[PDB]
Amino acid sequence: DYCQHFVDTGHRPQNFIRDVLIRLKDELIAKSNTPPMYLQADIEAFDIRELTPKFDVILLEPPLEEYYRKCWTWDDIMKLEIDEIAAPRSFIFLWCGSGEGLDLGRVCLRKWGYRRCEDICWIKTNKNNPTLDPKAVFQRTKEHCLMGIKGTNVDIDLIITEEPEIGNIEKPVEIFHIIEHFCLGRRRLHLFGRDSTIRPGWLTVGPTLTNSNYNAETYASYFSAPNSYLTGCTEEIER
Amino acid sequence: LFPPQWICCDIRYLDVSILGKFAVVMADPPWDIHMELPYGTLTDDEMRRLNIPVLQDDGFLFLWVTGRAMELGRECLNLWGYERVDEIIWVKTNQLQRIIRHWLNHGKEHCLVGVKGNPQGFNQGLDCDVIVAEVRSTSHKPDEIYGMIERLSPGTRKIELFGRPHNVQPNWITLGNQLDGIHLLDPDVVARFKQRYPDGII
Numbered sequence: 001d002y003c004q005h006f007v008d009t010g011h012r013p014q015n016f017i018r019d020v021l022i023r024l025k026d027e028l029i030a031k032s033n034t035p036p037m038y039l040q041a042d043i044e045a046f047d048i049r050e051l052t053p054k055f056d057v058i059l060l061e062p063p064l065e066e067y068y069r070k071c072w073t074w075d076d077i078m079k080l081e082i083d084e085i086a087a088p089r090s091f092i093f094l095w096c097g098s099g100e101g102l103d104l105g106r107v108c109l110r111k112w113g114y115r116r117c118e119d120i121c122w123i124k125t126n127k128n129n130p131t132l133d134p135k136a137v138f139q140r141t142k143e144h145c146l147m148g149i150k151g152t153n154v155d156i157d158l159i160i161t162e163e164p165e166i167g168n169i170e171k172p173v174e175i176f177h178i179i180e181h182f183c184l185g186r187r188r189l190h191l192f193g194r195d196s197t198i199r200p201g202w203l204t205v206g207p208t209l210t211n212s213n214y215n216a217e218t219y220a221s222y223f224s225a226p227n228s229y230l231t232g233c234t235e236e237i238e239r
Numbered sequence: 240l241f242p243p244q245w246i247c248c249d250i251r252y253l254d255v256s257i258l259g260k261f262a263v264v265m266a267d268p269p270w271d272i273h274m275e276l277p278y279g280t281l282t283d284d285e286m287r288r289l290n291i292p293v294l295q296d297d298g299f300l301f302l303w304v305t306g307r308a309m310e311l312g313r314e315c316l317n318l319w320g321y322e323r324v325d326e327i328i329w330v331k332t333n334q335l336q337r338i339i340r341h342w343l344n345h346g347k348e349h350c351l352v353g354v355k356g357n358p359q360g361f362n363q364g365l366d367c368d369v370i371v372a373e374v375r376s377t378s379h380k381p382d383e384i385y386g387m388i389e390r391l392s393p394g395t396r397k398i399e400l401f402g403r404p405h406n407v408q409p410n411w412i413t414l415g416n417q418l419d420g421i422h423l424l425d426p427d428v429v430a431r432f433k434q435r436y437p438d439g440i441i
């Protein structure tokens with residue numbers, strides 16, 4: 001009993017999980033990926049309809065006050081017009097934290113027109129270090145990333161990593177691996193990304209980016225024929 | 240600190256008011272998850288209509304959810320007069336402490352935690368919201384949840400809905416339709432049972 005154990009020692013049960021050829025896919029994903037594109041934009045004060053074309057995949061990482069033991073509330077997040085930039089068949093991965101986000105993020109998913117089809121849990125170990133919202137019953141040692149779909153399996157719905165140092169806000173990069181392994185389409189948007197999250201195959205838009213290279217026309221050009229429908233897991237077509 | 244008690248019954252039809260008030264309610268319902276399943280399920284409506292609000296004035300509800308029940312269980316939890324304040328996940332392991340393998344293989348089961356009214360003298364924040372434990376059967380929750388609930392609310396009276404025989408525990412009354420008859424020892428409950436059901440016919 002690791003619950004019992006944790007009560008005696010401060011070693012989280014998840015500390016004890018041991019062992020926490022698909023390189024072929026990883027290579028296709030790598031060859032398929034667009035150049036990284038990125039835009040500094042104050043998302044509050046910015047018409048997201050300027051983000052074209054419509055995305056196959058949106059990774060939405062709004063900075064919750066809860067991450068800090070400008071923050072966005074669920075009030076601010078729920079007013080984003082995500083349904084205006086999402087392709088009719090598309091995916092959303094929303095980082096919802098560990099609190100009221102588990103409810104309000106579901107409302108957001110349904111407001112934008114998605115149904116939740118997975119719940120990915122980021123389980124934080126404290127092996128190098130064996131805090132409480134007033135409503136909490138238990139110590140919170142995990143965060144949820146909700147997967148939503150609108151329209152029409154190498155990986156598991158768990159990511160296990162060590163808790164990051166205090167006021168380090170980053171989500172595990174493994175989330176990108178899980179999303180890329182799904183081969184959903186090459187138009188991938190990360191909202192509230194940072195310099196540190198910029199990645200081939202993604203458009204990163206956020207307030208703290210120090211530089212921009214985004215151009216709607218150049219970005220559209222990567223997905224025009226013959227390339228419109230590529231999954232992200234198949235070779236580019238010859239020329 | 241009563242020994243195990245239980246009532247084989249159909250929880251849709253039992254008059255649950257005979258049972259009194261509980262510091263902790265736990266439910267592991269066979270939700271209609273819109274897949275063919277070995278076992279019988281309750282419809283969305285029978286789940287919403289369950290007379291959960293009579294079972295507590297102040298305290299916690301533990302609600303096991305899978306699939307579309309992550310959304311339906313949240314509905315039910317709010318319809319019943321609870322706010323969701325925590326969510327436990329059970330990480331399923333084998334004997335070697337390895338995770339047991341849809342867009343995604345499911346490594347975990349979810350238990351929602353609801354609060355009603357003003358719970359006092361609970362030990363909040365003793366345990367964390369992650370359980371790591373072996374799957375010993377299909378369709379069994381892990382026994383560690385009883386420990387976490389005991390440390391949270393020591394020696395209070397608790398009720399489990401849709402519990403199976405292995406789930407009978409001291410300080411708990413277990414309801415479900417796979418239990419073996421009626422075994423009741425709390426004389427308050429015994430008296431209100433005999434009065435409501437003079438012929439023992441639920």
Ligand SMILES: CC1(C)CCN(Cc2ccc3nc(Cn4cc(-c5cc(Br)cc6n[nH]cc56)nn4)cn3c2)CC1
Binds near residue numbers: 270414
């Ligand atoms: C940890 C988990 C993986 C464990 C299994 N979870 C689903 C689940 C599956 C099967 C199951 N059987 C029971 C027992 N059971 C079922 C009834 C019962 C069934 C009906 Br049709 C009408 C009833 N009226 N009154 C009691 C009734 N009573 N007891 C709980 N169950 C819960 C999901 C989470």
